[PDB]
C-alpha cells in the first residue's frame, strides 16, 4: 500500500525536519493578526490534518493524500510573498516531498 | 469501478447524515444522567450513536460494511423502542432513516 | 479475514479486559515512580495502549510487526524487573493467553 508509505515514510520525514513546525497544524490567522488569510484561502491544509486523515482512513487512496500536501505548499505560495522566511521552508520540505514521492511503490 | 464499501459508508454516507439539521441528538450517545433518564441503560441493552459509528469507520473496528449497516439500524431502532410515536425525537430519526436509506442504495459493488 | 483486524478485535480486545492488564495499558510511567534507569535498559519501550492506538491509527505495515511489539512488551518486563516479581508473573498470564490467541490466526 501506498498510504502506508506515505504515513510511515513521506509525513514521518517531512515531520521530523526543522523547518515543519510552522505546517504542523492550521496557521492560526486569529493570533497572528490576519483577517484576510481565510478569506483568500480556501482549502486551508495541513501535515495536522494530513497525519489525522491518514490515522483515521479518510482518503479514497494516496492519490488524494498526495493533492493534499500539493495544496498545503501552494497554499503557502499563494498567501505569502516569495521569498519570505515562510516560503524558502516550504521550498524544501516541498523539494524533500518530491524526492521521496518518486520511491513509491505501486499497489 | 472499484469502491470500497466502508470507505463510502464514511466520505458519503456518514458525512451527508453527520451535516443534516436533525442530526445533533445522535452525535453523541444518549446522556441519561444530563436528562435523569435513569431507565435508558435498561431498556436500550445496546445503545448507538453517530459518534461511535464514526470512531469505528476512523479506527479500522468494522470487519465488514454489514456490520457498519447494522449498528446504523440499532441506532434507529433504539431510538424508537425508547420513544413514543409521534415525538419530535422520533420524525427526526425518520428523516435521517429515509435519507440513509437512500445513501445505502447507491453503494458500491 | 485479515491478520491486522484478528489482532484488533481478538487478541488486543481479550488481552485488554483480562485482569492483569492494567499495569500493560500505558506507558511505564518512569517519572511517577522514580526510576531514573528505566529508558537507559529499555531502550523500545512497549505497551498495549500504544499497541491500540497502532492498530486504530494506521501503523503497521504488516501483522509480524504489530506482533513483535507484542513480544517487546512482555519481555520489556521480564528484562527490567527481577523473576518472581508480581508484575512478571502477570505478564506470563498475559503472554500465555497472548500465545493461545495466536495459534487461531487467519489464513
Ligand atoms: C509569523 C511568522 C514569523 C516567522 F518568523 C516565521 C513563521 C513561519 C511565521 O509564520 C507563522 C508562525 C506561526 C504560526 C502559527 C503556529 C501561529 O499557526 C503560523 C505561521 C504562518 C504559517 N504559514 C504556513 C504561513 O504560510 C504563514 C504564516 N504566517 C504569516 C504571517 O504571520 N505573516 C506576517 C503578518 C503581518 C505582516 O505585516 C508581517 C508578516
Ligand atoms: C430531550 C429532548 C428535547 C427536545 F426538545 C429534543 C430532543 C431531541 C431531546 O432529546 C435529547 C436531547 C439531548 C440529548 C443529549 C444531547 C443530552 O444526549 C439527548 C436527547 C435524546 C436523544 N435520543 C437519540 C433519544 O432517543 C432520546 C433523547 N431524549 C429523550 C428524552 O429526554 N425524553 C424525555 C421524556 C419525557 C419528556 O416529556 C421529556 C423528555
Ligand atoms: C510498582 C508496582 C507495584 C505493584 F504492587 C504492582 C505493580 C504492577 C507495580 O508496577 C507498576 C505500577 C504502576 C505503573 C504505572 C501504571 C504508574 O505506569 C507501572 C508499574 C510497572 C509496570 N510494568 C509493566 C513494569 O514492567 C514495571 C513497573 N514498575 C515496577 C517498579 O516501579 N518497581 C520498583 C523498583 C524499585 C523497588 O524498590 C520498588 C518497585
Same mark, same amino acid.
Given at each position: ?7 510511515? *515514510? *513521506?509525513?514521518?520525514?517531512?515531520? @521530523? ?9 492550521? *496557521?492560526?490567522?486569529? &493570533? ?6 481565510? @478569506? ?10 494530513? &497525519?489525522?486523515?491518514? +490515522? ?7 492519490? +488524494? ?15 505569502? &510573498? ?8 516550504? +521550498?524544501?520540505? +516541498? &523539494?524533500?516531498?518530491?524526492? @521521496? ?7
Amino acid at each position: 500500500n501506498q498510504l502506508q508509505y506515505l504515513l510511515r *515514510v *513521506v509525513l514521518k520525514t517531512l515531520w @521530523k525536519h526543522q523547518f515543519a513546525w510552522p505546517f504542523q497544524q492550521p *496557521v492560526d490567522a486569529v &493570533k497572528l493578526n490576519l483577517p484576510d488569510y481565510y @478569506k483568500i484561502i480556501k482549502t486551508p491544509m495541513d501535515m495536522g490534518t494530513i &497525519k489525522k486523515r491518514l +490515522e483515521n482512513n479518510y482518503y479514497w487512496n494516496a492519490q +488524494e493524500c498526495i493533492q493534499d500536501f500539493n495544496t498545503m505548499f501552494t497554499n503557502c505560495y499563494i498567501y505569502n &510573498k516569495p521569498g519570505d522566511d515562510i516560503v524558502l521552508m516550504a +521550498e524544501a520540505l +516541498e &523539494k524533500l516531498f518530491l524526492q @521521496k514521492i518518486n520511491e513509491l511503490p505501486t499497489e
